[PDB]
Structure 1
Amino acid sequence: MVVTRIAPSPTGDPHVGTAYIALFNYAWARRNGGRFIVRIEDTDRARYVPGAEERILAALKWLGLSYDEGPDVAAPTGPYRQSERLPLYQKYAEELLKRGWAYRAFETPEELEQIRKEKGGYDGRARNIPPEEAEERARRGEPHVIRLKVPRPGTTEVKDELRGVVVYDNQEIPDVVLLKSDGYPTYHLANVVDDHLMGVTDVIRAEEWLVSTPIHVLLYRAFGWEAPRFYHMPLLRNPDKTKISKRKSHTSLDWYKAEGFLPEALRNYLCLMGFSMPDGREIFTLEEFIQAFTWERVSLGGPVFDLEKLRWMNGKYIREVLSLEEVAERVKPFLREAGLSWESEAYLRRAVELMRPRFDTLKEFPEKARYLFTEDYPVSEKAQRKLEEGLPLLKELYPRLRAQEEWTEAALEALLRGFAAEKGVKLGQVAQPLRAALTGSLETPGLFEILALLGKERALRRLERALA
């Protein structure tokens, strides 16, 4: 009964990093009939940001990674919020004591600060305080911590499902705090009780934890509870590598959703972060991934999160996967948002189809195809420049357009070809200025499709504005 989790901390912005750890957790589950749990790691009250939790859960739902147990909904396995599970930590911290696997240490932080400068760190000196003594002190309410009572003269072996087994001398492993004076678990205490209680069976986490496993492993043993399987994930970087960073990479999922990145494409791209499809395919998320899914094809090289690649992928979703009615529906929110509108659903679809080739994000739509939805669009300096070199020609041309009835590309083309032909001028000297005058651009899709589309009176009205 594979059971996986993600345990993000409501200390900010939905991280791309969490989408990433979460997808391999979501995949492994589903790929096994199992469950995918969600636990909020909200104890670092210093770090806590109010709506951060809310935006986290939303985003995973946004990529379409649903969970069967989480906060917003509780479930069998009681609390799904560390800060609400508080008592459950004193009690194991205690049980762990009532068994000599842990101990109290009363050194002030100042005191601790000096052992350090002298022994490289904590020499576990409080371990020589008669147990019952240590308890007296506790009673009196003497501030102490609960440390791990690592069997010092022994050995520890940890196995990572992707990196293999490692042997540890217990000297390498330190007497870590489990409980602070205020009595708040350290990651080590919490992760193990929670994992245990919530029944997670496979731990898929940030590589960053690799090192501390020997400790997690000792704890499972300290409680004499079965160790789960550990999967330490390769970790995200930038092109010209470096553990990804806010400065030097956008790491907010909300940013992605706002810039018009499609959920599916982001998702399809996190998949490619270490993991190759047998058949070399870089397109089809979820369903097809969570079946190809095998630890066998997961890379350990710290995958590069290239945005240029993502937009390449996003553009592919726009033009070779989604259908014209689907795209045309997703661009709506951005039109609104840009203060636009379309006179019919037909137009909207004829604008999206002519533009498809030219935008890789839903957000770039209202920007590039502006002139198609408002009579008030921007004129580049080059367009204007051009509209002037050809001004006399549009002057001459307006009356012919004014007469035109059949406003078809076909008609329109023949007319313009006529006029160039009749004026001792190549179509281009009629074409650019017109284009400049119509769309304010000078770089655009099919000029006749662009003249036709708007219809007569949009064209005409915009033609005078430029002349008159």
Structure 2
Amino acid sequence: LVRVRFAPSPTGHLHVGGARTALFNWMFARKEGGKFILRIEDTDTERSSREYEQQILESLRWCGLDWDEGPDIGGDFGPYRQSERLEIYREYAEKLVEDKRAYYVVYDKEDPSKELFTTYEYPHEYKEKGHPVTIKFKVLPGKTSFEDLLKGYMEFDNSTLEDFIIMKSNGFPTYNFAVVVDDHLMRISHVFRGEDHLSNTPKQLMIYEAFGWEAPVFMHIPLILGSDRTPLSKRHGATSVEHFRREGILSRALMNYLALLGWRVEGDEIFTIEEKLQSFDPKDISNKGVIFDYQKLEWVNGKHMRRIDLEDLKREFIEWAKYAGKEIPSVDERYFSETLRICREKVNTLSQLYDIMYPFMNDDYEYEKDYVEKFLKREEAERVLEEAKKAFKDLNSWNMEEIEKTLRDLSEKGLASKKVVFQLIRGAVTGKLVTPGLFETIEVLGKERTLKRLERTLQFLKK
């Protein structure tokens, strides 16, 4: 039975690298008909919190990576938080001591750094007196090897590793011990994780061997890097899923990009995880690190925004806005769709879409600084707007030809240059100097809105 896991340490937000690691596990499980387990690795009490755990679960959900077992839904191999499994680690570390593969180390009490002696017999008298006591794993001579799905055959000389602690004096396991005990007990068949854990693998294999357990199949996924080839960090730019979500990157687009990284996909670069799920093959994954390109991500997002159904885009837009704390006012559905169809040709993120959609959705839009200073303040601004209002008002047919003629007549009759006429009207009805086609904009806004806004702009000018 195929069982994979995403085992995040909730010490912060879900990094896109983590999302990519989770994506490949999720795709392998759904394609193979297996299970995707979510294990929270929160033994670092100081840095982990339920707030971060929750933020991570929310981000995974938003990325469309639902799990079959976890801290919230449970399952038959829990608890799913390592902080809730301290007794399990204790019992299994004890099995190793009893089998002479691990031993207790007793330290001085006044000077905790001073080792007093080692023993296979639990030192009750020292424990009761407050002496620190740890458990160390006994490294056996020999070789430790495994065939990684992406990194190939790996070999390790045991002799180069000194006996190491698996249980700390505070009662908590070390990360490597907890991971092996949990991957084993949660019956994980495949461990797909970031390459930053490749070096921890020989040690983990030694523990599996000490218990007489069969180790799962391993695959270490190269990391997502910044342009200088170091792991993607804050200094490179955004790194959390939550950030891209807030900026308006569509989930399906972010996941498309994370899968696209380093993959010379055959066919369209624009795709959904869903359609690539059936032919998913772990070996298609690049064995080299991948560089995150913010510009390319935005380009991918733009492609999705224009390709999806207008109403699909509308839902994405509405939910994003609500999530961002600035939900869309209530408007006519046809009008909503029309303005969306026009505004989406020009933007690449839901946030950029929100900015240009605002004047279409609300009458209280603000006038840009440059519009007021560069155009509205000119001497001819008033008569241009008054004449525009007069001619538009007399229009009996609100089509683009008549709208175009109305603007043409304003400059040809000498009220101002063509540029000033166009910009004065554009800013008057949107408050912006850059917008989708001016005739399309006026047409969809309608006669009444156009008149109201020209009047509104005139009153504003009068200050």
Match of 1:48 in 2: 48
> 1:423: Cα distance to partner?
4.0
User: CA separation in 1, counterparts of 2:28 and 2:319?
Assistant: 34
Q: How does 1:295-334 map to 2 (within 5 A)?
A: 295-320=282-307, 322-333=308-319
Distance 1:314 1:110, change over 3 A: farther
Match of 1:122 in 2: none
Asked if residue 222 in structure 1 is aligned to residue 210 in structure 2, the reply is yes
Per-residue deviation, residues 118-165 of structure 1 (Å, max 9, x unmatched): xxxxxxx95xx45448677567764211111001x4222233221122
The answer on whether the counterparts of 2:109 and 2:132 sit within 8 Å (CA) in structure 1 is no
Asked if residue 361 in structure 1 is aligned to residue 352 in structure 2, the reply is no
TM-score (norm 2): 0.90
What letter is aligned with 2:376?
L
Please, which of 426, 431, 438 is the counterpart of residue 422 of structure 2? Answer: 431
User: CA separation in 1, counterparts of 2:319 and 2:196?
Assistant: 39
Distance 1:61 1:158, change over 3 A: same
Match of 2:404 in 1: 413
Match of 2:431 in 1: 440
The answer on whether the counterparts of 2:107 and 2:131 sit within 8 Å (CA) in structure 1 is no
Asked if residue 171 in structure 1 is aligned to residue 162 in structure 2, the reply is no
Query: Is there any run of 5+ residues in structure 2 with no aligned partner, and where?
Result: none
Please, which of 131, 137, 142 is the counterpart of residue 148 of structure 1? Answer: 137
User: CA separation in 2, counterparts of 1:14 and 1:425?
Assistant: 55
Match of 1:393 in 2: 384
> 1:84: Cα distance to partner?
1.2
SS in 1 for 2:279: coil
User: CA separation in 2, counterparts of 1:54 and 1:133?
Assistant: 39
Bigger Cα displacement from structure 2, 254-263 vs 423-432: 423-432
User: CA separation in 1, counterparts of 2:153 and 2:83?
Assistant: 34
> 1:106: Cα distance to partner?
2.1
Per-residue deviation, residues 395-433 of structure 1 (Å, max 9, x unmatched): 333322222232222322233334444449764443232
The answer on whether the counterparts of 1:276 and 1:298 sit within 8 Å (CA) in structure 2 is no
> 1:341: Cα distance to partner?
1.9
The answer on whether the counterparts of 2:43 and 2:82 sit within 8 Å (CA) in structure 1 is yes
Bigger Cα displacement from structure 2, 191-200 vs 251-260: 251-260
TM-score (norm 1): 0.89
Match of 2:225 in 1: 237
Match of 1:270 in 2: 258
The answer on whether the counterparts of 1:407 and 1:452 sit within 8 Å (CA) in structure 2 is yes
Asked if residue 206 in structure 1 is aligned to residue 177 in structure 2, the reply is no
User: CA separation in 2, counterparts of 1:456 and 1:316?
Assistant: 33
> 1:365: Cα distance to partner?
2.0
> 1:176: Cα distance to partner?
1.6
User: CA separation in 2, counterparts of 1:419 and 1:81?
Assistant: 71
The answer on whether the counterparts of 1:334 and 1:366 sit within 8 Å (CA) in structure 2 is no
> 1:166: Cα distance to partner?
2.4
What letter is aligned with 1:167?
E
The answer on whether the counterparts of 2:318 and 2:328 sit within 8 Å (CA) in structure 1 is no
User: CA separation in 2, counterparts of 1:467 and 1:435?
Assistant: 14
Asked if residue 31 in structure 1 is aligned to residue 31 in structure 2, the reply is yes
What letter is aligned with 1:29?
A
Bigger Cα displacement from structure 2, 436-445 vs 101-110: 101-110
Q: How does 1:23-172 map to 2 (within 5 A)?
A: 23-107=23-107, 129=118, 131-132=120-121, 137=126, 142-151=131-140, 153-172=141-160
User: CA separation in 1, counterparts of 2:365 and 2:328?
Assistant: 11
Distance 1:144 1:417, change over 3 A: same
User: CA separation in 2, counterparts of 1:331 and 1:373?
Assistant: 13
> 1:255: Cα distance to partner?
2.1
User: CA separation in 2, counterparts of 1:366 and 1:175?
Assistant: 59
What letter is aligned with 2:317?
V
What letter is aligned with 1:323?
D
Match of 2:279 in 1: 292
Asked if residue 377 in structure 1 is aligned to residue 365 in structure 2, the reply is yes
Distance 1:426 1:166, change over 3 A: same
User: CA separation in 2, counterparts of 1:113 and 1:286?
Assistant: 52
> 1:274: Cα distance to partner?
3.4
SS in 2 for 1:171: helix
What letter is aligned with 1:37?
I
SS in 2 for 1:106: strand
Distance 1:270 1:35, change over 3 A: same
User: CA separation in 2, counterparts of 1:192 and 1:424?
Assistant: 80
SS in 1 for 2:69: coil
User: CA separation in 2, counterparts of 1:133 and 1:419?
Assistant: 96
The answer on whether the counterparts of 2:180 and 2:204 sit within 8 Å (CA) in structure 1 is yes
SS in 1 for 2:136: strand
The two structures, once aligned, show a CA RMSD in angstroms of: 2.5
What letter is aligned with 2:368?
S
The answer on whether the counterparts of 2:255 and 2:272 sit within 8 Å (CA) in structure 1 is yes
The answer on whether the counterparts of 2:109 and 2:131 sit within 8 Å (CA) in structure 1 is no
User: CA separation in 2, counterparts of 1:44 and 1:85?
Assistant: 13
How many percent of aligned residue pairs carry the same amino acid?
A: 40
SS in 2 for 1:287: helix
The answer on whether the counterparts of 2:104 and 2:119 sit within 8 Å (CA) in structure 1 is no
What letter is aligned with 2:283?
E
The answer on whether the counterparts of 1:234 and 1:299 sit within 8 Å (CA) in structure 2 is yes
Query: Is there any run of 5+ residues in structure 1 with no aligned partner, and where?
Result: 116-124
Q: How many residues align?
A: 454
What letter is aligned with 1:158?
F
What letter is aligned with 1:287?
E
User: CA separation in 2, counterparts of 1:110 and 1:298?
Assistant: 53
Per-residue deviation, residues 338-391 of structure 1 (Å, max 9, x unmatched): 364253011111111111112211122221222212222232333222234441
